[model samples]
Target: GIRAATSQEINELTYYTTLSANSYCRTVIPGATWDCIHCDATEDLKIIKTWSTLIYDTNAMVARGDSEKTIYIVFRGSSSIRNWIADLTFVPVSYPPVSGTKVHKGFLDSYGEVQNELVATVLDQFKQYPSYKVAVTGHSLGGATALLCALDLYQREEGLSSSNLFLYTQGQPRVGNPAFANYVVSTGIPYRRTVNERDIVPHLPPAAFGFLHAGSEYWITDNSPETVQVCTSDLETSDCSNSIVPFTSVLDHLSYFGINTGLCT
Candidate 1:
């Protein structure tokens, strides 16, 4: 129930899609940099480390046709500058039925054992793309491994289909409480989040006190390197005097994807 592709097939699936870098590291915690710079390769982009398995053939005909979606298995962890993508499909009402002691009392006992081998490698890539209709996203720490792989696909009832499943996280943290973000919004299941500005992991640690929930929240501001001020909830901060001051080196966190769009400046 969620299909839309054609911006020239999303730019030919973003040019044969290839972006991998996340090799999990928690060396006693300190800044922790996984360095993934590869809009078009400035270097880096070569961390596969371990755990590699992919299979997606749902019915095996893509380019916008041929049956049940099929395959999107990406479980790459070892956070060496963040590279996480976990989405295993099997949607049953955005994943209902929870137990295993309520996912070991919320979020598989606080994500132990590399989150159970990243949910058994996303349920073995959802038994080989059992026909698409499965959604999971990642950004920071691969958005907590796509929220513990959607809490183990909502504890295995697996009847997801209302828009099947979706979780587009961009700077996620706080994986629980506030009633698990109100049980991912009463289970209609659409958790979209994007936060910048104080990009310190959305003020981490149990949502760093004042846990605010109810979907969509974006407040980005990189004001330079060609202007970026997507503030909707008021964060003008005097508009940084009409910004545009970012290029000092290392491509300044990427001069806004231009320089031939190779990525990472």
Candidate 2:
């Protein structure tokens, strides 16, 4: 089977994940970012799984409407000194044929802690709703988690084809090394990454540090709709996220729904 996401498909997943980035764990209230980006598209859907932990926290929602079906895994990015602390723990470890050089243990272990529970929920969903497609998404720290989660799915979902899964990660940092990137590339799953111009998160945990990103880049250069550019396969493309040169701006990571969108200061 083959896999490729149309522009509309790409746009849709990125849009929701951004809204998801606007969200938080059920016990936590929506912050200003959530309030700014939450809109009419936010609809009623029963949430069957909720995740909360010191290492990783996220929300899972599924849709099985009369005409639509999907599994949406939304992640919350770094919000505290805790995240920076997690980043510092990055040490290379075996990721298998996927990444000969490997990933940040801090991230992989965090995902490992919750991967079984998350996997159970997803497998349950597929068993009950075979018609629904699965999508994993997140931004920044959430993005890193999403990528690792997708990789887990690939390893565990023996009956599923890559076509059945799609990943949309925004401002995601490198969770694995080059071999890991190639592993995803070898599979047909659609992993699309959206990097907002000047958002520095995607540029790290620095390739020099032995991390690599998967998926084709959808570079958001400005507030304009036309600003989105689909870059080539070369991860180091000048037109891609890797090319946001000269500086790192966390502020740039703050608002993904355009400059006017989210709680931009």
Candidate 3:
């Protein structure tokens, strides 16, 4: 059964989606120009840190939203040719945390590079804002990495579990196999992976390669307000993004909720 996103959910989704886009900015200095696609949407937050992993040029940011009482860890999508290279490495490798599960080698390796620092930063923030929630987001490859980061944080940090942690990813490709997908569900960490129109990336790694997506599906059939479909939590559902399987557009992958997810302005 499909239902449109509620007004409140749409507004919150738009806010996180914009944060995902802002992660691509070369810099996001509050009050100063972040040069992001939706600068105003992110300006009010306190930009805790902006980091880049030179190994594969992975960019991400940590921000604290005092008004909302939430901490956000946003990852930028593939911005370099090297990232594209990583995206194509479809080999599945065993996920260390969970047994009988496997994930994308490239994604795991890329995330491994920044996991320690990012997780440490998040834990430190919680030390000061223990009652605040943690919201994680990213688009495309960044989305895949964010998923891994979220899982790592949930497993590693105390008092941070499904109750206080939220995840939202846009146009993210499948990052693991069926076992891995089930593992995510078993953890009970609330998450939604949004697909805009017919984004081609969501169909990727070709299900034949054993890659599968986790989290509930939130498909934006149209960017119009309240048009997003709340798809099933099942890994793959034809009622959602799979409906237009053979006819996906790359253009759709570049935007979500009317914002260019990859470009900074």
lDDT of 1: 0.35
lDDT of 2 by residue, 81-189 (tens): 6666776678888875353557787777667766777788778877887877777777777777777777777777555568788788777778877777777677677
Model 2 ranges off by over 4 Å: 1-10, 25-40, 55-67, 96-101, 234-236, 259-265
Query: Which 10 consecutive residues of model 2 have the lowest summed lDDT?
Result: 25-34
* Per-residue lDDT of model 1, residues 70-121, tens digit only: 3232222223212221121111111134321111122232244344555554
lDDT of each: 0.35, 0.64, 0.85
In the range 33-94, model 3's lDDT, one tens digit per residue, is: 45555887777788887778878777777889899899989888888887999888878989
Model 3 CA deviation exceeding 4 Å by range:
29-35
How many collisions per candidate?
A: 23, 1, 0
Which predicted model would earn the best TM-score?
3
Give the TM-scores of the predictions, in the order they appear.
0.27, 0.83, 0.95
What TM-score would candidate 3 get against the native?
Answer: 0.95
